[PDB]
Amino acid sequence: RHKILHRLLQ
Amino acid sequence: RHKILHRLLQ
Amino acid sequence: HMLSDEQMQIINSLVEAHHKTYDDSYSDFVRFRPPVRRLSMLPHLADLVSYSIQKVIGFAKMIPGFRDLTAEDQIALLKSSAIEIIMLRSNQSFSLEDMSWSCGGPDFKYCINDVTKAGHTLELLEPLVKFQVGLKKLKLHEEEHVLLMAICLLSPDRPGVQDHVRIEALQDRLCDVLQAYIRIQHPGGRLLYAKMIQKLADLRSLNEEHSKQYRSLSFQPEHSMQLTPLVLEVFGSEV
Amino acid sequence: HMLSDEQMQIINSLVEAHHKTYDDSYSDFVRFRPPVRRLSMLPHLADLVSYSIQKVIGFAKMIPGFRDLTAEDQIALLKSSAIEIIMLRSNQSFSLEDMSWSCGGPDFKYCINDVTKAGHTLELLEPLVKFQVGLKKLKLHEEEHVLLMAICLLSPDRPGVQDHVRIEALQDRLCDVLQAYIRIQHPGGRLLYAKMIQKLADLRSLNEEHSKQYRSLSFQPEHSMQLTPLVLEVFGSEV
Ligand SMILES: C=C1/C(=C\C=C2/CCC[C@]3(C)[C@@H]([C@@H](CCCC(C)(C)O)[C@@H]4C[C@H]4CCC(C)(C)O)CC[C@@H]23)C[C@@H](O)C[C@@H]1O
Ligand SMILES: C=C1/C(=C\C=C2/CCC[C@]3(C)[C@@H]([C@@H](CCCC(C)(C)O)[C@@H]4C[C@H]4CCC(C)(C)O)CC[C@@H]23)C[C@@H](O)C[C@@H]1O
């Protein structure tokens, strides 16, 4: 999914 | 999924 | 006109289960991520709620009848009643004096403003404080308390239950015990059982309000990362 | 025979990015779930690793070239290099004196025995301490350190990368900068760049060992609940 990783890369 | 709930119900 | 042997067993079993799962000292709170006063208190409350869910599950594991339900049914009851049982058990810490949950010193005293730094709205916190005061005033015996909790958890009208007849059968046996108890053991409570069942209808509104605001939290990935895997399993929709 | 303007920019950019993302005080550790000495230290280390991942991501966001990769590529590099960059940045806290990461008093001093109460094996912790000592002895400049980190992260041989040519092009430009730096700026390092590239091959074994033991942790639901959502996203296989 990677919802958080995407968020964390502005 | 509920992996943890299943575990927590012995 | 007198409590039966089977009704007394149900009360012993439930009171013990509560005692085995509620630390009146709140001593384990030093293990949670410290409270801070961008959703400042959210780490600490997520740890608090996560810890509580584990105590609720342990309590439920000991409500007579609960273990024999299918694992699907057990999960369905927990996932929906979780926040309700928490608000219910949390009344033991709510103090009428300062209108706040008092679980320690200045650190673990949760007053209305702190939960605002946890992604929830001052506006919709109104009914929760109101609920806690009216319940505090009901001055419930530990038996009525533990009984009310098991009844809340055993509601057959939860999304996901399959055996809504067995769960209904369990929940009525528990109401009988409660009406009996108040009737033969709680003087002056000619109106108390209705007052208690009213509190159950309130909890569903609270449950509803919380679901709308938690969905806002779990849809923002910078806030959900502060949650715990247990919290995300319980309040998420992966059924 | 002298560093170029573009090579100097890359060094400024990387050194700053490290400084912007490495708190030499370890002052935020009081926000983690306290360390305890059934996988006693696992809460604290999961918080420690989770916090670090956020600093690694911020560093990577500032490696020149990294931002222009696809988001898929950016995720692929992070998910595989994460634990490696952590072991790398963590060398700044490793002390040769007592052979432990020293991030505070008795609380945040992580010695070999504590990580054993975190689901990992004393036996496979051997190479990690060994790696940290040999790297400590390399006495790297901050430039060589930050450079080694960006090179580790930009390896085109990670599972998931699609543009393994652009990532390779970025990683070679960074190696040139490093060889130049050691060559024109680090006296006595006639053999240092090879020593540094050797450390990169070591990290892949560490990365490998950790993946086998973390899978054991994430497959036991009572241990994974102690992890953080970021940790489970990063070290899980949901690609
Ligand atoms: C939990 C316990 C205790 C205390 C329990 C508290 C006091 C602190 C605030 C808590 C945790 C409330 C909030 C839950 C937040 C959780 C996340 C962020 C995940 O949403 C609640 C959402 C708000 C407002 C309601 C409404 C607006 C309508 O949604 C529920 C129970 C409350 C103390 C002790 O007695 C042990 C007991 O187990
Ligand atoms: C992280 C940092 C710092 C310190 C970093 C430490 C010291 C404490 C131990 C840590 C966290 C190690 C373990 C990671 C555990 C994580 C979970 C449980 C999720 O698996 C590692 C698995 C073991 C052994 C290896 C092998 C057996 C081969 O797998 C990696 C980096 C280490 C301090 C400061 O310098 C900031 C810096 O960012």
Side-chain angles (χ1 to χ4, degrees), chain C residues 3 8 20 56 60 64 71 87 115 130 144 151-152 163 186 199 208 210 215 231:
Chain C
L3 243 47
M8 177 231 66
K20 199 221 89 85
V56 171
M87 293 160 158
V115 201
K130 172 179 168 74
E144 299 153 343
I151 298 168
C152 170
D163 198 350
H186 192 119
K199 302 291 182 172
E208 206 61 34
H210 173 273
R215 241 189 304 276
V231 157

PDB file of all heavy atoms in Angstrom, chain C residues 3 8 20 56 60 64 71 87 115 130 144 151-152 163 186 199 208 210 215 231:
ATOM      1  N   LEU C   3     -31.713 -13.909  44.393  1.00  0.00           N
ATOM      2  CA  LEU C   3     -30.822 -14.260  43.291  1.00  0.00           C
ATOM      3  C   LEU C   3     -30.599 -15.769  43.219  1.00  0.00           C
ATOM      4  O   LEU C   3     -30.442 -16.445  44.244  1.00  0.00           O
ATOM      5  CB  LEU C   3     -29.486 -13.541  43.472  1.00  0.00           C
ATOM      6  CG  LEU C   3     -28.945 -12.507  42.479  1.00  0.00           C
ATOM      7  CD1 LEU C   3     -29.957 -11.455  42.054  1.00  0.00           C
ATOM      8  CD2 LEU C   3     -27.765 -11.831  43.134  1.00  0.00           C
ATOM      9  N   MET C   8     -25.872 -15.855  40.373  1.00  0.00           N
ATOM     10  CA  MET C   8     -24.775 -15.485  41.250  1.00  0.00           C
ATOM     11  C   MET C   8     -23.436 -15.859  40.630  1.00  0.00           C
ATOM     12  O   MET C   8     -22.474 -15.092  40.731  1.00  0.00           O
ATOM     13  CB  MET C   8     -24.980 -16.144  42.618  1.00  0.00           C
ATOM     14  CG  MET C   8     -23.871 -15.914  43.622  1.00  0.00           C
ATOM     15  SD  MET C   8     -23.321 -17.483  44.329  1.00  0.00           S
ATOM     16  CE  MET C   8     -22.587 -18.310  42.911  1.00  0.00           C
ATOM     17  N   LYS C  20      -9.437  -8.615  37.370  1.00  0.00           N
ATOM     18  CA  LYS C  20      -8.278  -9.136  36.679  1.00  0.00           C
ATOM     19  C   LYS C  20      -7.845  -8.263  35.508  1.00  0.00           C
ATOM     20  O   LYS C  20      -6.771  -8.501  34.960  1.00  0.00           O
ATOM     21  CB  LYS C  20      -8.589 -10.551  36.207  1.00  0.00           C
ATOM     22  CG  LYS C  20      -7.380 -11.389  35.885  1.00  0.00           C
ATOM     23  CD  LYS C  20      -7.595 -12.232  34.610  1.00  0.00           C
ATOM     24  CE  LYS C  20      -7.171 -11.502  33.305  1.00  0.00           C
ATOM     25  NZ  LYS C  20      -5.708 -11.595  32.915  1.00  0.00           N
ATOM     26  N   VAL C  56     -10.102  -4.894  27.570  1.00  0.00           N
ATOM     27  CA  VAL C  56     -11.459  -5.227  27.145  1.00  0.00           C
ATOM     28  C   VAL C  56     -11.519  -6.647  26.587  1.00  0.00           C
ATOM     29  O   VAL C  56     -12.414  -7.422  26.940  1.00  0.00           O
ATOM     30  CB  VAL C  56     -11.961  -4.186  26.129  1.00  0.00           C
ATOM     31  CG1 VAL C  56     -13.271  -4.640  25.531  1.00  0.00           C
ATOM     32  CG2 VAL C  56     -12.129  -2.837  26.803  1.00  0.00           C
ATOM     33  N   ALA C  60     -13.794  -9.682  27.968  1.00  0.00           N
ATOM     34  CA  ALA C  60     -14.746 -10.384  27.109  1.00  0.00           C
ATOM     35  C   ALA C  60     -14.480 -11.880  27.102  1.00  0.00           C
ATOM     36  O   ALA C  60     -15.421 -12.687  27.179  1.00  0.00           O
ATOM     37  CB  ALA C  60     -14.696  -9.821  25.682  1.00  0.00           C
ATOM     38  N   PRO C  64     -19.292 -15.212  30.561  1.00  0.00           N
ATOM     39  CA  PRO C  64     -19.805 -16.545  30.233  1.00  0.00           C
ATOM     40  C   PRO C  64     -20.617 -16.482  28.953  1.00  0.00           C
ATOM     41  O   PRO C  64     -21.383 -15.542  28.728  1.00  0.00           O
ATOM     42  CB  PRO C  64     -20.664 -16.912  31.448  1.00  0.00           C
ATOM     43  CG  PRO C  64     -21.004 -15.607  32.069  1.00  0.00           C
ATOM     44  CD  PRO C  64     -19.811 -14.729  31.848  1.00  0.00           C
ATOM     45  N   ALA C  71     -15.083 -17.414  16.110  1.00  0.00           N
ATOM     46  CA  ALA C  71     -14.071 -16.372  16.215  1.00  0.00           C
ATOM     47  C   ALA C  71     -14.495 -15.146  15.425  1.00  0.00           C
ATOM     48  O   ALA C  71     -14.219 -14.007  15.828  1.00  0.00           O
ATOM     49  CB  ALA C  71     -12.721 -16.901  15.746  1.00  0.00           C
ATOM     50  N   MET C  87     -15.137   3.803  26.890  1.00  0.00           N
ATOM     51  CA  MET C  87     -15.842   4.907  27.542  1.00  0.00           C
ATOM     52  C   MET C  87     -16.550   4.446  28.804  1.00  0.00           C
ATOM     53  O   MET C  87     -16.661   5.206  29.772  1.00  0.00           O
ATOM     54  CB  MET C  87     -16.855   5.527  26.582  1.00  0.00           C
ATOM     55  CG  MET C  87     -16.234   6.234  25.393  1.00  0.00           C
ATOM     56  SD  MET C  87     -17.437   6.398  24.056  1.00  0.00           S
ATOM     57  CE  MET C  87     -16.720   7.768  23.153  1.00  0.00           C
ATOM     58  N   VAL C 115      -7.731  16.121  24.797  1.00  0.00           N
ATOM     59  CA  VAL C 115      -8.214  15.238  23.740  1.00  0.00           C
ATOM     60  C   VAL C 115      -8.434  16.012  22.439  1.00  0.00           C
ATOM     61  O   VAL C 115      -8.528  15.414  21.356  1.00  0.00           O
ATOM     62  CB  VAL C 115      -9.475  14.521  24.269  1.00  0.00           C
ATOM     63  CG1 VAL C 115      -9.755  13.228  23.490  1.00  0.00           C
ATOM     64  CG2 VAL C 115      -9.266  14.224  25.747  1.00  0.00           C
ATOM     65  N   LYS C 130     -20.666  14.694  29.105  1.00  0.00           N
ATOM     66  CA  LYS C 130     -22.036  14.596  29.606  1.00  0.00           C
ATOM     67  C   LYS C 130     -22.380  13.156  29.966  1.00  0.00           C
ATOM     68  O   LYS C 130     -22.911  12.882  31.045  1.00  0.00           O
ATOM     69  CB  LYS C 130     -23.007  15.159  28.561  1.00  0.00           C
ATOM     70  CG  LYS C 130     -24.497  14.954  28.859  1.00  0.00           C
ATOM     71  CD  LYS C 130     -25.377  15.574  27.762  1.00  0.00           C
ATOM     72  CE  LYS C 130     -26.843  15.136  27.874  1.00  0.00           C
ATOM     73  NZ  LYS C 130     -27.615  15.775  28.998  1.00  0.00           N
ATOM     74  N   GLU C 144     -23.355  -3.881  38.992  1.00  0.00           N
ATOM     75  CA  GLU C 144     -24.127  -3.241  37.927  1.00  0.00           C
ATOM     76  C   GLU C 144     -23.215  -2.726  36.824  1.00  0.00           C
ATOM     77  O   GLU C 144     -23.546  -2.816  35.635  1.00  0.00           O
ATOM     78  CB  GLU C 144     -24.982  -2.116  38.512  1.00  0.00           C
ATOM     79  CG  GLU C 144     -25.964  -2.636  39.534  1.00  0.00           C
ATOM     80  CD  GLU C 144     -26.352  -1.607  40.588  1.00  0.00           C
ATOM     81  OE1 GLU C 144     -25.637  -0.592  40.735  1.00  0.00           O
ATOM     82  OE2 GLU C 144     -27.383  -1.824  41.276  1.00  0.00           O
ATOM     83  N   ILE C 151     -23.284  -6.468  28.980  1.00  0.00           N
ATOM     84  CA  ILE C 151     -24.468  -6.270  28.167  1.00  0.00           C
ATOM     85  C   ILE C 151     -24.153  -5.397  26.960  1.00  0.00           C
ATOM     86  O   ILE C 151     -24.610  -5.675  25.844  1.00  0.00           O
ATOM     87  CB  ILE C 151     -25.592  -5.683  29.021  1.00  0.00           C
ATOM     88  CG1 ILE C 151     -25.939  -6.685  30.115  1.00  0.00           C
ATOM     89  CG2 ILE C 151     -26.763  -5.412  28.139  1.00  0.00           C
ATOM     90  CD1 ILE C 151     -26.810  -6.149  31.184  1.00  0.00           C
ATOM     91  N   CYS C 152     -23.369  -4.335  27.151  1.00  0.00           N
ATOM     92  CA  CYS C 152     -23.040  -3.485  26.016  1.00  0.00           C
ATOM     93  C   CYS C 152     -22.324  -4.287  24.953  1.00  0.00           C
ATOM     94  O   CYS C 152     -22.655  -4.217  23.767  1.00  0.00           O
ATOM     95  CB  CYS C 152     -22.179  -2.307  26.453  1.00  0.00           C
ATOM     96  SG  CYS C 152     -21.539  -1.418  25.003  1.00  0.00           S
ATOM     97  N   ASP C 163     -24.362 -14.958  14.239  1.00  0.00           N
ATOM     98  CA  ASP C 163     -25.279 -15.609  15.171  1.00  0.00           C
ATOM     99  C   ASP C 163     -25.874 -14.582  16.134  1.00  0.00           C
ATOM    100  O   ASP C 163     -25.739 -14.670  17.357  1.00  0.00           O
ATOM    101  CB  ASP C 163     -24.567 -16.734  15.917  1.00  0.00           C
ATOM    102  CG  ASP C 163     -25.534 -17.730  16.561  1.00  0.00           C
ATOM    103  OD1 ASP C 163     -26.756 -17.463  16.608  1.00  0.00           O
ATOM    104  OD2 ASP C 163     -25.062 -18.794  17.020  1.00  0.00           O
ATOM    105  N   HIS C 186     -30.307  -3.567  45.224  1.00  0.00           N
ATOM    106  CA  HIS C 186     -29.981  -2.144  45.103  1.00  0.00           C
ATOM    107  C   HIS C 186     -31.179  -1.325  45.555  1.00  0.00           C
ATOM    108  O   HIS C 186     -32.086  -1.040  44.758  1.00  0.00           O
ATOM    109  CB  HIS C 186     -29.569  -1.785  43.672  1.00  0.00           C
ATOM    110  CG  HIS C 186     -28.950  -0.427  43.539  1.00  0.00           C
ATOM    111  ND1 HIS C 186     -27.664  -0.240  43.085  1.00  0.00           N
ATOM    112  CD2 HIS C 186     -29.436   0.809  43.807  1.00  0.00           C
ATOM    113  CE1 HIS C 186     -27.382   1.049  43.075  1.00  0.00           C
ATOM    114  NE2 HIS C 186     -28.441   1.708  43.507  1.00  0.00           N
ATOM    115  N   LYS C 199     -28.305   4.659  28.970  1.00  0.00           N
ATOM    116  CA  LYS C 199     -26.888   4.908  28.746  1.00  0.00           C
ATOM    117  C   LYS C 199     -26.359   4.103  27.570  1.00  0.00           C
ATOM    118  O   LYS C 199     -25.408   4.523  26.901  1.00  0.00           O
ATOM    119  CB  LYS C 199     -26.105   4.567  30.004  1.00  0.00           C
ATOM    120  CG  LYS C 199     -26.557   5.327  31.188  1.00  0.00           C
ATOM    121  CD  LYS C 199     -26.209   6.785  31.049  1.00  0.00           C
ATOM    122  CE  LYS C 199     -26.637   7.516  32.306  1.00  0.00           C
ATOM    123  NZ  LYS C 199     -26.159   8.909  32.313  1.00  0.00           N
ATOM    124  N   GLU C 208     -20.805   6.392  17.187  1.00  0.00           N
ATOM    125  CA  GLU C 208     -20.974   6.927  15.842  1.00  0.00           C
ATOM    126  C   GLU C 208     -20.073   8.138  15.617  1.00  0.00           C
ATOM    127  O   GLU C 208     -19.332   8.199  14.623  1.00  0.00           O
ATOM    128  CB  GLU C 208     -22.438   7.281  15.594  1.00  0.00           C
ATOM    129  CG  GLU C 208     -22.813   7.223  14.128  1.00  0.00           C
ATOM    130  CD  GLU C 208     -22.628   5.834  13.548  1.00  0.00           C
ATOM    131  OE1 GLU C 208     -22.859   4.852  14.294  1.00  0.00           O
ATOM    132  OE2 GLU C 208     -22.247   5.725  12.357  1.00  0.00           O
ATOM    133  N   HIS C 210     -17.373   9.035  17.116  1.00  0.00           N
ATOM    134  CA  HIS C 210     -15.979   8.649  17.114  1.00  0.00           C
ATOM    135  C   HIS C 210     -15.583   8.012  15.792  1.00  0.00           C
ATOM    136  O   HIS C 210     -14.495   8.276  15.272  1.00  0.00           O
ATOM    137  CB  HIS C 210     -15.748   7.698  18.270  1.00  0.00           C
ATOM    138  CG  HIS C 210     -14.392   7.092  18.281  1.00  0.00           C
ATOM    139  ND1 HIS C 210     -14.087   5.944  17.583  1.00  0.00           N
ATOM    140  CD2 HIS C 210     -13.259   7.467  18.916  1.00  0.00           C
ATOM    141  CE1 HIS C 210     -12.820   5.638  17.790  1.00  0.00           C
ATOM    142  NE2 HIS C 210     -12.295   6.547  18.592  1.00  0.00           N
ATOM    143  N   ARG C 215     -12.147   8.073  11.326  1.00  0.00           N
ATOM    144  CA  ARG C 215     -11.922   7.878   9.896  1.00  0.00           C
ATOM    145  C   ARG C 215     -11.116   9.031   9.325  1.00  0.00           C
ATOM    146  O   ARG C 215     -10.213   8.825   8.507  1.00  0.00           O
ATOM    147  CB  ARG C 215     -13.242   7.719   9.145  1.00  0.00           C
ATOM    148  CG  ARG C 215     -13.380   6.372   8.428  1.00  0.00           C
ATOM    149  CD  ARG C 215     -14.603   6.306   7.499  1.00  0.00           C
ATOM    150  NE  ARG C 215     -15.851   6.592   8.198  1.00  0.00           N
ATOM    151  CZ  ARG C 215     -16.558   5.696   8.882  1.00  0.00           C
ATOM    152  NH1 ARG C 215     -16.189   4.424   8.932  1.00  0.00           N
ATOM    153  NH2 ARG C 215     -17.660   6.090   9.535  1.00  0.00           N
ATOM    154  N   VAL C 231      -4.906  -0.746  17.422  1.00  0.00           N
ATOM    155  CA  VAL C 231      -5.915   0.276  17.185  1.00  0.00           C
ATOM    156  C   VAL C 231      -6.376   0.246  15.741  1.00  0.00           C
ATOM    157  O   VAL C 231      -7.580   0.334  15.456  1.00  0.00           O
ATOM    158  CB  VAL C 231      -5.370   1.661  17.567  1.00  0.00           C
ATOM    159  CG1 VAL C 231      -6.138   2.763  16.827  1.00  0.00           C
ATOM    160  CG2 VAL C 231      -5.432   1.840  19.074  1.00  0.00           C
TER     161      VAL C 231
END
